[PDB]
Amino acid sequence: VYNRVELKDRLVAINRVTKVTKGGRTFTFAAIVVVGNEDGVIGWGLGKAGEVPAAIAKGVEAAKKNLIRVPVHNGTIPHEQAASYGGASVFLKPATTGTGVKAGGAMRAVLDSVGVTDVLAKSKGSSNPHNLVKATIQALAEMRSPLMVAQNRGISVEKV
Amino acid sequence: MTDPIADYLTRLRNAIMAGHRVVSVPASNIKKEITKILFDKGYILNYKFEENDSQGIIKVALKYDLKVNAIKKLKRVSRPGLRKYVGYRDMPRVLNGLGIAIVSTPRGVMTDKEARELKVGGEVLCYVY
Amino acid sequence: PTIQQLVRKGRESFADKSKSPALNSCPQRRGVCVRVYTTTPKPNSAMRKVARVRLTNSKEVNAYIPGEGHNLQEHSIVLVRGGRVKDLPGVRYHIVRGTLDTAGVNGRTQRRSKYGAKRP
Amino acid sequence: ARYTGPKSKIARKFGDPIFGADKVLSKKNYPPGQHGTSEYGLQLREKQKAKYTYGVLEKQFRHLFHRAQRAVTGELLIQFLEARLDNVVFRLGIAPTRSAARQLVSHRHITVDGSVVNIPSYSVKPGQVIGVRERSKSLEVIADALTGFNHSKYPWMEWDQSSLSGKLLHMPDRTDIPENIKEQLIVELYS
Amino acid sequence: ATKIRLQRHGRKGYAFYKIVVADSRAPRDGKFIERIGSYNPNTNATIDLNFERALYWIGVGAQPTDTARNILSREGVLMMKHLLGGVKKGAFDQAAA
RNA sequence: UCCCAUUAGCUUGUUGGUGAGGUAACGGCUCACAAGGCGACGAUGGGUAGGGGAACUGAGAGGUUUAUCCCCCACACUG
RNA sequence: UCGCGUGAAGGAAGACAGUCUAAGGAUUGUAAACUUCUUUUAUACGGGAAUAGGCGAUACGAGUAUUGCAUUGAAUGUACCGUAAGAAACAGCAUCGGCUAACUCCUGCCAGCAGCGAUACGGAGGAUGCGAGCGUUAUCCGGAUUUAUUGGGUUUAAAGGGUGCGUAGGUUGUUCGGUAAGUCAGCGGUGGAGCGCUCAACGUUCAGCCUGCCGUUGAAACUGC
RNA sequence: GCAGUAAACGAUGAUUACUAGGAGUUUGCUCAAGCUUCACAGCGAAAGCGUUAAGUAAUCCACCUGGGGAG
RNA sequence: CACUAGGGUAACCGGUGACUGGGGCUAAGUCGUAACAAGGUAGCCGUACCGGAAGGUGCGGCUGGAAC
Ligand SMILES: [K+]
Ligand SMILES: [K+]
Ligand SMILES: [K+]
Ligand SMILES: [K+]
Ligand SMILES: [K+]
Ligand SMILES: [Mg+2]
Ligand SMILES: [Mg+2]
Ligand SMILES: [Mg+2]
Incomplete structure (x- = not known):
């Protein structure tokens, strides 16, 4: 995964995460954030702070710190790709130019942050936000451009 | 042995996973054809055939970048338990045209591109990309 | 399983049961009020009005009476529809208000069509 | 059916002057109700804005949407909405507002290609003539809206005041139609 | 019998x-x-008709109804009298009138 | 071209041959030697359905159901 | 199921409701003042669905004139007065979801779920959907990959037979030739653009699949023999 | 001579081919069989498995489709 | 020759019956404390015998057990 170290922020989900102590229950606040510039660079992070704005800010900082470069062309994907992370599995396929993003939720947030316009996306695992976004970014990272495939194989006129 | 072609694909895949540079195989005619197809399509560095007292040996030197192999996935399609036959009009595209499918046809053993050019179908041996 | 195992045996698909089996694939049935009584919920502690009714399809069931104020009594012809109550084991049917012997709720000005009350 | 209700309430709800100019657009401009949002809320606001500004109900709007999908879908849905008898009559200036245009079309006052058409949802293809009835060219209300105003700010209408007719050159592109509607939101909602 | 009719x-x-x-x-x-x-x-009545097939069926002996007989009288399908070789060999052209 | 093996053997004109009769017509269709035939690729027995194109519905794989319509079959209180 | 109407443009913050003694919501909403009639009513004209004796002459076909013929039916449509006049409901507003004040009750009740017994129960005021409909129940599909050939699994969540031998069945190292059953190919047979509904549902025509079955010619890499 | 059950357990069916290292041990002689615990890639929900796989593949068999009712 | 009608034995599909036994859910009134910690005698599987009741004991097996 090429790290490639302005991107807008998208809040995927927040969680009311608790703790048990003899005195009582102490509550934290977690948040998954994805940063992207709709260009081919997307990062994700997890903020774990007390207040909701503090958690969102920490997640934004973590997502900005951890960024990768996703090879894209126009607004579609070069080929179909399936990837599983944890209890979640994702499948992405290219679609027609006048189709838009056909998926909702964490998949929609990740694909909007990466800027892909036309894509057919389906989730076959669980609806966990962490594993879902991680599987989607893994699927995007394992994606090879036609130029990259040509460079790895040799000649660039292999498709003929 | 049950499926020698699947065994050949598995040997190649295991060598790629282990990051070896060469791999040896007990030779066969259809496997000689498959490795010739792979070499002319640009997935391995080179090959060599050694005709010994046995059926023979195939030695394949694989292709690595300046450390990623040129081959990403090998998938056997027509297994003995379920044979797959297709025509030229319904032949499949592997990795949306960036990968190949080895196909045995009455005109010989070639890929899906050459098979669709020659308008002939047959057995789909494997998907390679 | 293997391909030959599937060829020999195959796959078996079950049938989903109907949530209202006493209706016999009908929207509503007609019955007579065999008994009119009151039941206690399974953390609610209310007094829910129910009627045991013998439907014309040769079946006896328990039907809840929604709303506040029922003019029904024993041996009354009622219209019974589907729909169960969560906090009451047993009962799984409702009695339509404003149909046959059952009368609409008096003094209702909202949700009138669900309790059979005309426009005032 | 038709809305036939209060218009300033919708105007203050949506902020934009969809029906036209009013004093309430600048005085007491806030959503209605004594007590006065998720992306569902904004998408619903956009769809209802289009429906209220074009006088279309839900089933007809859905039919228009999937007709546009069959034949950018959000881009040509807006021109499909614009290509309507009442809307074209209103844009030709012969009637003050879209409700007035709808009433004029529904009554026996408007002809298409010389034949009177009184369906105020008839799609008007390019290269067609829409004109006032020859028996209704001398109405007191019919003339003050067209004559005097004479906006003619749309580069897809030909007016020809010497015949009181009008022609649609072609379907205008999505940038030249002065409607503040984000079609991406509506196509995402209906997708 | 075999007929020529309208549904x-x-x-x-x-x-x-x-x-x-x-x-x-x-x-x-x-x-x-x-x-x-x-x-x-x-x-003001548009009629589509397969001339060759209508001639073939009226030759093998399908009886037309009254309205179908009028439809065959139009479009010149009943020219079997002229095509029966009535002491001639040429083909007249009455379709222009 | 539906389920049941908590349905394993079934059939005695049943399988074939000769001859005759009968039929629009071949034929155990019927009437006067050899013995067979059919079954774990499900005979036989039991339960339930009229069958298709349509129609509805799924990206596809398909599936559901014959409400109107069309084609075939069976029937006209029961034999 | 489709289409239309229940009016169109202006008119300041009436009386009556709510929530706060004034302010805000109803609210440009009503009331008058100016036009229009789709539609209803009363009258008139009123289509279309209706097309089917001589003169060649082969002596009869066949081609040409005339005649009556509408159950629907004042039915489409066209035209004439005098009028907004005759024409809007239903559901839900604590999360999922679009939509919030006050009074009741504090059991009566409500619910698809988290459940509340109230920004959840009943009413009053406003709000939000849809709209001649709106909800409730019943039945069937998809999401469901919840039978997984495409496309699931079996250490601990359900799931390896106590272990072997073995019948039917399923699978078959390498190579040289034949055949043509599987497989492949060819050739035959069969089974979106307009037009009219004033628009639309809907009628109707041609470009367009027949990719299922059968016949007949060839190919031999792979499976079978 | 019957009976045919078990936490009859590695709670892990049989066969074939391939893929990293450390610590011991038995037999046949540094090599090959076997025998058990830490441990790459990979797999897994995790505990963990890891050349004796629960990794990569192929062939056949057995079994599962929410919990009680109920073996 | 067979449509029926008649007697009789045999099936299958069904009702009802003096009396006699499981299961589910709601109450929880009573009696003990079997399991969850070494749950106060480690637990569980099979089998046999014996008890108001959960259970106890004998023989073999397992760790899905401590503790040494
Ligand atoms: K005519
Ligand atoms: K380990
Ligand atoms: K105890
Ligand atoms: K104990
Ligand atoms: K043992
Ligand atoms: Mg309607
Ligand atoms: Mg288990
Ligand atoms: Mg075992």
Whole structure:
């Protein structure tokens, strides 16, 4: 995964995460954030702070710190790709130019942050936000451009 | 042995996973054809055939970048338990045209591109990309 | 399983049961009020009005009476529809208000069509 | 059916002057109700804005949407909405507002290609003539809206005041139609 | 017997007839052997007709109804009198009138 | 071209041959030697359905159901 | 199921409701003042669905004139007065979801779920959907990959037979030739653009699949023999 | 001579081919069989498995489709 | 020759019956404390015998057990 170290922020989900102590229950606040510039660079992070704005800010900082470069062309994907992370599995396929993003939720947030316009996306695992976004970014990272495939194989006129 | 072609694909895949540079195989005619197809399509560095007292040996030197192999996935399609036959009009595209499918046809053993050019179908041996 | 195992045996698909089996694939049935009584919920502690009714399809069931104020009594012809109550084991049917012997709720000005009350 | 209700309430709800100019657009401009949002809320606001500004109900709007999908879908849905008898009559200036245009079309006052058409949802293809009835060219209300105003700010209408007719050159592109509607939101909602 | 007739294939208030070749025992809009044209009495009356097939069936001996006989009288299908070789060999042209 | 093996053997004109009769017509269709035939690729027995194109519905794989319509089959209180 | 109407443009913050003694919501909403009639009513004209004796002459076909013929039916449509006049409901507003004040009750009740017994129960005021409909129940599909050939699994969540031998069945190292059953190919047979509904549902025509079955010619890489 | 059950357990069916290292041990002689625990890639929900796989593949068999009712 | 009608034995599909036994859910009134910690005698599987009741004991097996 090429790290490639302005991107807008998208809040995927927040969680009311608790703790048990003899005195009582102490509550934290977690948040998954994805940063992207709709260009081919997307990062994700997890903020774990007390207040909701503090958690969102920490997640934004973590997502900005951890960024990768996703090879894209126009607004579609070069080929179909399936990837599983944890209890979640994702499948992405290219679609027609006048189709838009056909998926909702964490998949929609990740694909909007990466800027892909036309894509057919389906989730076959669980609806966990962490594993879902991680599987989607893994699927995007394992994606090879036609130029990259040509460079790895040799000649660039292999498709003929 | 049950499926020698699947065994050949598995040997190649295991060598790629282990990051070896060469791999040896007990030779066969259809496997000689498959490795010739792979070499002319640009997935391995080179090959060599050694005709010994046995059926023979195939030695394949694989292709690595300046450390990623040129081959990403090998998938056997027509297994003995379920044979797959297709025509030229319904032949499949592997990795949306960036990968190949080895196909045995009455005109010989070639890929899906050459098979669709020659308008002939047959057995789909494997998907390679 | 293997391909030959599937060829020999195959796959078996079950049938989903109907949530209202006493209706016999009908929207509503007609019955007579065999008994009119009151039941206690399974953390609610209310007094829910129910009627045991013998439907014309040769079946006896328990039907809840929604709303506040029922003019029904024993041996009354009622219209019974589907729909169960969560906090009451047993009962799984409702009695339509404003149909046959059952009368609409008096003094209702909202949700009138669900309790059979005309426009005032 | 038709809305036939209060218009300033919708105007203050949506902020934009969809029906036209009013004093309430600048005085007491806030959503209605004594007590006065998720992306569902904004998408619903956009769809209802289009429906209220074009006088279309839900089933007809859905039919228009999937007709546009069959034949950018959000881009040509807006021109499909614009290509309507009442809307074209209103844009030709012969009637003050879209409700007035709808009433004029529904009554026996408007002809298409010389034949009177009184369906105020008839799609008007390019290269067609829409004109006032020859028996209704001398109405007191019919003339003050067209004559005097004479906006003619749309580069897809030909007016020809010497015949009181009008022609649609072609379907205008999505940038030249002065409607503040984000079609991406509506196509995402209906997708 | 084999007949040439019209089946009402349209909408209420708009009669559109299909000219077919069918047995006399078949239902009006049911089974037929061959479709040979269309007919619409609402216009001022558009008639589609397969000339060759209509000639073949009227030659093998399919009896047309009254309206189908009028439709065959139009479009010059009953020229079998002229085509019977009535002490001649040329073909006249009455279609221009 | 539906389920049941908590349905394993079934059939004695049943399988074939000769001859005759009968039929629009071949034929155990019927009437006067050899013995067979059919079954774990499900015979036989039991339960339930009229069958298709349509129609509805799924990207596809398909599936559901015959409400109107069309084609075939069976029936006309029961034999 | 489709289409239309229940009016169109201006008119400041009436009386009556709510929530706060004034302010805000109803609210440009009503009331008058100016036009229009789709539609209803009363009258008139009123289509279309209706097309089917001589003159060649082969002596009869066949081609040409005339005649009556509408159940629907004042039915489409066209035209004439005098009028906004005759024409809007239903559901839900604590999360999922679009939509919030006050009074009741504090059991009566409500619910698809988290459940509340109230920004959840009943009413009053406003709000939000849809709209001649709106909800409730019943039945069937998809999401469901919840039978997984495409496309699931079996250490601990359900799931390896106590272990072997073995019948039917399923699978078959390498190579040289034949055949043509599987496989492949060819050739035959069969089974979106307009037009009219004033628009639309809907009628109707041609470009367009027949990719299922059968016949007949060839190919031999792979499976079978 | 019957009976045919078990936490009859590695709670892990049989066969074939391939893929990293450390610590011991038995037999046949540094090599090959076997025998058990830490441990790459990979797999897994995790505990963990890891050349004796629960990794990569192929062939056949057995079994599962929410919990009680109920073996 | 067989449509029926008649007697009789045999099936299958069904009702009812003096009396006699499981299961589910709601109450929880009573009696003990079997399991969850070494749950106060480690637990569980099979089998046999014996008890108001959960259970106890004998023989073999397992760790899905401590503790040494
Ligand atoms: K005519
Ligand atoms: K380990
Ligand atoms: K105890
Ligand atoms: K104990
Ligand atoms: K043991
Ligand atoms: Mg309607
Ligand atoms: Mg288990
Ligand atoms: Mg075992």
